[PDB]
Symmetry: C4
Subunit: 388 residues, 4 copies
Amino acid sequence: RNFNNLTKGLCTINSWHIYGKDNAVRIGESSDVLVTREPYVSCDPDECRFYALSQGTTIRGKHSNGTIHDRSQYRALISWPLSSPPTVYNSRVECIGWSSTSCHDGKSRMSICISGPNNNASAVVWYNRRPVAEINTWARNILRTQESECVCHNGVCPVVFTDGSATGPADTRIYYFKEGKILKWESLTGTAKHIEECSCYGERTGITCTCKDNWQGSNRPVIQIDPVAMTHTSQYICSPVLTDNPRPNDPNIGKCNDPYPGNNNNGVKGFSYLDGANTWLGRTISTASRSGYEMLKVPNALTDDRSKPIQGQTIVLNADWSGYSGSFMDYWAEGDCYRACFYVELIRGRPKEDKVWWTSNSIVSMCSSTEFLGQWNWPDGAKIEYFL
Amino acid sequence: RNFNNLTKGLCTINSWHIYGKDNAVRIGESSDVLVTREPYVSCDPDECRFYALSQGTTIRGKHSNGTIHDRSQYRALISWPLSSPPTVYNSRVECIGWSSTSCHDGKSRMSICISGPNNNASAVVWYNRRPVAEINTWARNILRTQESECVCHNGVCPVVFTDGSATGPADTRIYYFKEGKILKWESLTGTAKHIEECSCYGERTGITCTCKDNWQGSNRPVIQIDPVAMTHTSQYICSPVLTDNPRPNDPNIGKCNDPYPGNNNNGVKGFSYLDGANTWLGRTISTASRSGYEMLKVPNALTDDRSKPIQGQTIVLNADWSGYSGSFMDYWAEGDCYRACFYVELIRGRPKEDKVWWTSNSIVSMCSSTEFLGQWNWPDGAKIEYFL
Amino acid sequence: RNFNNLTKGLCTINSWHIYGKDNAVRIGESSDVLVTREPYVSCDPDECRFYALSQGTTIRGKHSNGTIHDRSQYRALISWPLSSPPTVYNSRVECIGWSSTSCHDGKSRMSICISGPNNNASAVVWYNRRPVAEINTWARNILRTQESECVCHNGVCPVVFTDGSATGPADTRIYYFKEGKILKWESLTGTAKHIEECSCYGERTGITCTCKDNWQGSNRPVIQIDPVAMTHTSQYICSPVLTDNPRPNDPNIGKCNDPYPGNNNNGVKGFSYLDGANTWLGRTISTASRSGYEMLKVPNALTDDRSKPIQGQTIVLNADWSGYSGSFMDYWAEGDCYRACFYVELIRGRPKEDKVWWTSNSIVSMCSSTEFLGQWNWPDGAKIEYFL
Amino acid sequence: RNFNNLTKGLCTINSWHIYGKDNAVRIGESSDVLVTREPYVSCDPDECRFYALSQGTTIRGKHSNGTIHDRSQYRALISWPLSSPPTVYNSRVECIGWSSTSCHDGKSRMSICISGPNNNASAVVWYNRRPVAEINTWARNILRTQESECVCHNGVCPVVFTDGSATGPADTRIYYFKEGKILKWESLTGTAKHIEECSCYGERTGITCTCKDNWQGSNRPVIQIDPVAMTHTSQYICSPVLTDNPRPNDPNIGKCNDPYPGNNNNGVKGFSYLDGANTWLGRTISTASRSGYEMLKVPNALTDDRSKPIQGQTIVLNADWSGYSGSFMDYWAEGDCYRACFYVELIRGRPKEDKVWWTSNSIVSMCSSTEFLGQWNWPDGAKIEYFL
Ligand SMILES: *[C@@H]1O[C@H](CO)[C@@H](O[C@@H]2O[C@H](CO)[C@@H](O[C@@H]3O[C@H](CO[C@H]4O[C@H](CO[C@H]5O[C@H](CO)[C@@H](O)[C@H](O)[C@@H]5O)[C@@H](O)[C@H](O[C@H]5O[C@H](CO)[C@@H](O)[C@H](O)[C@@H]5O)[C@@H]4O)[C@@H](O)[C@H](O[C@H]4O[C@H](CO)[C@@H](O)[C@H](O)[C@@H]4O[C@H]4O[C@H](CO)[C@@H](O)[C@H](O)[C@@H]4O[C@H]4O[C@H](CO)[C@@H](O)[C@H](O)[C@@H]4O)[C@@H]3O)[C@H](O)[C@H]2NC(C)=O)[C@H](O)[C@H]1NC(C)=O
Ligand SMILES: *[C@@H]1O[C@H](CO)[C@@H](O[C@@H]2O[C@H](CO)[C@@H](O[C@@H]3O[C@H](CO[C@H]4O[C@H](CO[C@H]5O[C@H](CO)[C@@H](O)[C@H](O)[C@@H]5O)[C@@H](O)[C@H](O[C@H]5O[C@H](CO)[C@@H](O)[C@H](O)[C@@H]5O)[C@@H]4O)[C@@H](O)[C@H](O[C@H]4O[C@H](CO)[C@@H](O)[C@H](O)[C@@H]4O[C@H]4O[C@H](CO)[C@@H](O)[C@H](O)[C@@H]4O[C@H]4O[C@H](CO)[C@@H](O)[C@H](O)[C@@H]4O)[C@@H]3O)[C@H](O)[C@H]2NC(C)=O)[C@H](O)[C@H]1NC(C)=O
Ligand SMILES: *[C@@H]1O[C@H](CO)[C@@H](O[C@@H]2O[C@H](CO)[C@@H](O[C@@H]3O[C@H](CO[C@H]4O[C@H](CO[C@H]5O[C@H](CO)[C@@H](O)[C@H](O)[C@@H]5O)[C@@H](O)[C@H](O[C@H]5O[C@H](CO)[C@@H](O)[C@H](O)[C@@H]5O)[C@@H]4O)[C@@H](O)[C@H](O[C@H]4O[C@H](CO)[C@@H](O)[C@H](O)[C@@H]4O[C@H]4O[C@H](CO)[C@@H](O)[C@H](O)[C@@H]4O[C@H]4O[C@H](CO)[C@@H](O)[C@H](O)[C@@H]4O)[C@@H]3O)[C@H](O)[C@H]2NC(C)=O)[C@H](O)[C@H]1NC(C)=O
Ligand SMILES: *[C@@H]1O[C@H](CO)[C@@H](O[C@@H]2O[C@H](CO)[C@@H](O[C@@H]3O[C@H](CO[C@H]4O[C@H](CO[C@H]5O[C@H](CO)[C@@H](O)[C@H](O)[C@@H]5O)[C@@H](O)[C@H](O[C@H]5O[C@H](CO)[C@@H](O)[C@H](O)[C@@H]5O)[C@@H]4O)[C@@H](O)[C@H](O[C@H]4O[C@H](CO)[C@@H](O)[C@H](O)[C@@H]4O[C@H]4O[C@H](CO)[C@@H](O)[C@H](O)[C@@H]4O[C@H]4O[C@H](CO)[C@@H](O)[C@H](O)[C@@H]4O)[C@@H]3O)[C@H](O)[C@H]2NC(C)=O)[C@H](O)[C@H]1NC(C)=O
Ligand SMILES: CC(=O)N[C@H]1[C@H]([C@H](O)[C@H](O)CO)OC(C(=O)O)=C[C@@H]1NC(=N)N
Ligand SMILES: CC(=O)N[C@H]1[C@H]([C@H](O)[C@H](O)CO)OC(C(=O)O)=C[C@@H]1NC(=N)N
Ligand SMILES: CC(=O)N[C@H]1[C@H]([C@H](O)[C@H](O)CO)OC(C(=O)O)=C[C@@H]1NC(=N)N
Ligand SMILES: [Ca+2]
Ligand SMILES: [Ca+2]
Ligand SMILES: [Ca+2]
Ligand SMILES: [Ca+2]
């Protein structure tokens, strides 16, 4: 086997087709399905799999009570076959913790899990299913990472971490791993003022990450990483099509180098594909809550502070709950281009649906098509009343 | 690995032997068995598997309520080991949607799933477990396909699709795929007046598909495909032994080039093996409903408008519910001929058994023998009262 | 891979050690464990597995009601990993039917299942997981076979079948298969007067089968098969240590060429290892019912009509229910001799325990040791009251 | 494949990072999780797995009643994927019995299980999943072994056994196996006065086992084995940091060649890594009961009868139940040193929590880091009240 190199550009995105859906909450009403949150998708050279942070209990289990909680000792990164639900009997534990990332370099997979109390957390870096390196908290305030896949080029896999405040300046670092070992790390540079939960993808231009500014911004910060030089830049998506949640209404001028104001101390993990005229942004439909999901074609969104949509696709109706979203691609597929993909976490239960005492989710996932395909909408599909 | 070529003729069919049976509804009374419908069987070079459209819930799950419904966002094509039931923990998701086909070309498997609303559905073509090509609705009226396996020759795998009315003229296309890519498509030609849910098999003569005319015909339309020239013809089975359901009683003269009249706007997926004196037709025993199943040896049924049975075998008693049926063969078996096989979907629940709120099925499957074997009958075997 | 040849003798049997136990009924009180009966064990070159006839329902399932029944359409030969229980999710279906045998020839496995009504049953012979040959009933009276593993030599795998009365002269045939194809069959010859449910093993001397005379005999008939010449002989175990059940008390003179009288029209499947001074016989402890199990070292039991035990080992206490027993060996193990093994079916439920409405079993299995090991006893271990 | 050789030293231990955790009791509240106890971890060259003695019932099953019991016929050594729980459907049975050890030699795995009544127990030695050798009880008083992994060097795998009194002098033997065959055994020599449940690890210096003195000692006996010469020595950990449970308070002078007095006829399985200045000892926090767990860096603990801690790490709070602990390492990992690892059994249920009628456990496991990582604590996490 050889390390994968990012040699292709993105395929032209003319619409999005259904890729995967697990219906986990529906099935888990009467099956041993693990409670999860913070899911994602990631491919090996021979298989693509769903990933998430388990809560170490099934949904029907009495221990599902209290699973709105983010960081217990009972959480772990698990993976399971594409579009199956995460069950006790089919889920493979990648590592133990409450914040994660994972990616295949073409030879083996690296998985990283962070665990610990708020003031003493640590990352353990796994490679080829063995622990290889460890990183202690540097700011003693909830060391945390992407919650979606990382990306590798010639064996080098950059990962974005943040340690420090969620409501003020924090200490973000970009680490560069190879075979699980730390080659290098660097402090965040550029104009992004706060970074969490980066969603990344790679193509010949390098690695592009769309993150969340939890502190002041409702536009999304972007980190662009050169995995050969092992350097990066940062800014915000310039477009006035704002993509965090909650967020203000879309203005006519966005902000390239500072947070667009209106909403503070909150946000949701999200993503974009930034590719000139082939640029597509994901966002919740609601400006107030994690409901609905849509894709919008916004030419040169990264650099054009006046850019507006010229095409779109609804993925989840505003009437239905969404959640985290992130990017991944099958780097090992046939063809001359990388097909952009994404997932949307469909959160069920607390805090929005409090008649149950649990919080979980299911997954829907799409990839791009060069056809202009008809659109459907893709709800979680479970009926909360059944769980009462 | 090499692409499979259709180099053999059918084995002589002198009776049918039991091949597989999953007892899914019996087992699912107390196990995490997924609700399904529209099942089939399909072989890889090293394994044969059961396939069906899941409803994204188990039978005992409260979400089984309402599963008479055909086209939700919670459906997916799944496969699972031969004669096991389709469980949450053993079912592999092939693609997402509510109409499907799948076949192995000798190197890898192609699976196709259609999803979307009635006026905006699309097919996604998967090859070697990756999405490769997409096809948008062309008539904006429930794009739909075979619901049983396709067949390949030297890498070319033809598939029959229909888009348009179920009760009048529609737009049927035959697509020719290789490695998931579209080589060619053509509009239906010939004398078949309406085409749905083709059941196909291949042999040195080419690929033969027996379909359903939902509009006016109670004889079955046939499409004969040359996978090298990538062309086809169509007509009806000439025999007065009528094989759709519901249907009129058998006359003494059938119809080769037009629907045999009596029953409109309904039908059931079915199959036949058309092979001169070695011809066998499948049909429900009842002329009114999906109950019973029998095989009848009807020499030259395809071409002889006076042909009658000279031998038969009961598969399911008229007292027991049947459903969809279709053809498949193990193209990778040893020997000098292809052994004809088929499955019968045994539907339980709604609309016929409405004391439960779900609709599901189990599978029974037979293959041909050159012996004249004794016959049994093969009911689903579940007791509805247990589910109350 | 090469066909296995029977080149070794039996290891010296000085005691029996625990080999496997699945505790199926205990576990099935609260797990999706299939109802079974007629179990056995059989090895591949890389794995040994448990086998049994499923009843197509779990024990806790309402369809377990009535499973005392022997021959429904819902039965199948299944296999599952050594010492695990037969669950819905881990059981592999080998073929469909209500009487079976199976064996690996060193290259692939042959499995045979019989299905059908009493007057029209048929065997389907599977090889490398595909149906290859079929055999119709020849006496129209419950065609039936070994219910434990067959044995192969240089690709030839003999199997004993019986068709006809259980209470009078019947038509027994020995079939010789290779790669699933019928090389030859012959009618039973020799002095055995009735043959059912042969338990076989192989060693350089040939293949030895210990069967059951259901009609008149409480001594066991023996069939000795030469798999090269494809011929056989038959007689009874000469020893007055009688090993059927029910049976009379042990006399001082046995019978070599006729049934030992006292009990008619009943019996249980059993086994022996007939090897001169290294001869060991299995039997129930009770003479009246299927309870208890013991091994007895009876020198030259096959040929000596005065032979008595000189050593023994209790396997299951008389206070505990037993059932069918049979022979198997790991033909692919290291060493200079074949280690004799056996299983005992531990039947729970009806008819002996009628407070439940089901009949099932678990498995215990032992192999021989050249040590003189201490003995334990091995009950099923389930408490019937828990199922009420 | 080649036999593994112990060619590396221990990595420098500066802290411990989370390695695995299965949350078995939490998950088993509503899933088919087997009741276990006496767990451990052991690696193959391509995978690391959890191991334990099943009780042949699930936790929610009614047969969980009475599982405080140590030695029934329903116990077996099982293994399952790292950090998954031991379920009916994912657990692989290694052998049958109520005391075990297991280890991979680089080519295949040896597993040993002891079964039988107290006065007639026997060990069966399995190699590459086949029984190879058997050992009868030599003292007729509960033949018993390590309850954690053994260690191999160039194909030779030493194992420590004890037969005889738990409250007085007993007969301990060290066996040396290769490919499951007995090369040699020897009686215990040295100054250890009672030996049970050795926890072993290997490094270039040889194989080091830390055991339990059940009779008089609250310091732990140590056996040091040369797997080439096949000889051993024994003594106690000299340190006054006492590590058995229950135990007296730590004095200022320990004992090298005799039991440190204060607590008789009890103890718990435990471990240490004895490596000069890189020495770390594990122990329960409580001196009275199996609660809490901590690691303490105690330079030259083995040889220095005045040695005290200079660093530590809490693993389980004193408020939480612990249990058995033992050593293992991934001998097949990359790098220039072997990374020390350990597991802690977290016992739930009886005798400490008697509102339930069962006894089971979950597992937490850590490995060493050369970083000085922040510490968390790792409770079982189940709420007993949920099981009522
Ligand atoms: C079968 O399936 C197919 C395929 O899915 C379906 O076809 C799809 O239909 C959907 C729904 O209509 C389309 O999505 C929308 O796309 C429009 C963009 O396209 C329009 O505008 C284009 C740009 O026009 C401008 O520039 C051009 C030059 O570049 C200039 O020519 C023009 O004059 C103008 O200046 C047009 O080019 C385009 O026309 C083309 O396409 C037409 C088909 O759509 C075709 O008929 C034409 O002939 C031509 O070919 C077209 O006019 C997006 O604007 C829109 O997204 C907005 O609206 C949705 C609600 O629907 C909202 O959720 C979005 O967030 C967004 O609106 C918010 O943001 C805006 C930007 O800031 C803001 O201005 C809005 O006020 C609004 O803001 C408010 O809400 C948000 C969200 O809550 C909040 O954050 C804000 O604060 C604020 O409160 C949709 O994405 C697909 O493109 C279309 N696909 C295709 C291939 O056709 C088909 O319908 C299905 N068939 C059936 C029968 O069902
Ligand atoms: C152990 O197992 C074995 C193996 O399974 C069992 O043996 C099997 O037994 C079954 C049941 O009897 C047989 O199935 C039937 O086969 C007949 C066809 O065979 C008969 O007819 C042949 C043709 O005769 C004609 O042509 C020849 C020349 O070609 C000429 O010589 C003759 O005079 C006549 O002109 C005969 O050749 C054949 O004889 C041969 O075989 C005999 C054994 O069967 C043997 O004894 C002879 O010596 C000779 O060797 C034989 O006479 C099918 O016709 C029949 O199917 C019809 O009937 C069933 C109900 O039973 C029905 O469900 C079918 O749909 C069908 O009838 C409907 O359709 C007809 C065609 O349109 C129509 O005419 C009918 O009126 C009827 O239509 C009505 O119902 C349908 C359905 O609801 C509806 O749609 C219509 O609208 C309308 O309402 C069976 O398939 C097996 O062939 C046979 N197998 C073997 C190898 O023997 C054995 O019984 C078991 N043993 C025990 C103890 O149980
Ligand atoms: C730890 O574990 C170890 C290992 O398991 C335990 O040791 C084992 O202990 C068991 C139980 O005692 C033994 O099983 C029994 O073996 C005897 C056979 O051995 C005895 O007889 C031998 C033959 O003697 C005759 O011939 C020799 C010459 O060949 C001659 O010298 C002698 O005078 C006589 O003529 C002796 O050689 C042998 O002695 C040797 O071994 C001794 C140890 O056992 C040792 O101490 C001596 O020094 C010497 O080395 C010994 O005396 C079997 O006969 C017996 O089986 C019968 O009894 C059981 C009930 O216990 C019954 O279930 C069996 O079916 C059978 O009896 C039925 O069938 C008979 C034959 O027809 C019939 O005659 C009986 O009347 C009876 O029939 C009735 O019941 C049946 C069944 O329901 C029914 O069908 C009939 O119709 C009728 O109603 C046992 O198998 C093991 O051999 C022994 N193993 C070893 C290695 O030692 C140890 O006990 C454990 N330790 C502890 C502390 O628990
Ligand atoms: C984020 O995470 C990090 C990493 O985990 C956290 O940092 C960790 O903090 C923990 C908790 O404090 C530390 O564990 C303790 O370690 C001490 C040992 O270190 C101390 O002592 C060292 C030795 O000093 C002696 O020798 C040196 C020369 O060698 C000499 O200089 C000195 O004067 C003295 O003579 C010191 O070197 C060391 O200082 C160094 O480290 C400091 C940081 O810790 C640093 O600040 C200094 O600058 C310097 O660098 C330090 O002083 C262990 O002694 C202790 O274990 C005892 O106490 C715990 C309870 O806390 C108890 O459970 C243990 O069993 C043990 O005490 C029992 O046994 C003793 C031995 O017999 C006995 O004497 C005690 O009385 C007691 O016995 C009683 O209880 C037991 C148990 O029930 C019973 O059996 C007996 O019978 C009896 O009843 C802890 O292990 C970590 O080392 C530390 N790690 C690191 C890398 O810093 C950090 O806190 C977290 N941050 C936050 C914000 O939460
Ligand atoms: C695409 C679709 O919904 N196909 C239907 C099909 C269809 O309604 C009729 O053929 C008429 O066109 O009939 C029914 C049926 O059992 O009659 C099953 C199919 N259900 C599914 N494939 N999901
Ligand atoms: C084919 C068949 O039904 N075989 C029977 C067998 C049979 O009734 C007797 O041997 C008499 O002929 O006995 C019973 C039995 O436990 O006595 C089990 C077998 N059940 C099954 N194999 N399913
Ligand atoms: C063979 C056996 O029963 N070993 C016991 C062990 C033993 O009783 C003591 O060490 C005294 O000798 O203690 C207990 C224990 O938790 O204290 C667990 C072990 N249970 C099992 N291994 N099943
Ligand atoms: Ca924000
Ligand atoms: Ca019709
Ligand atoms: Ca008899
Ligand atoms: Ca002690």
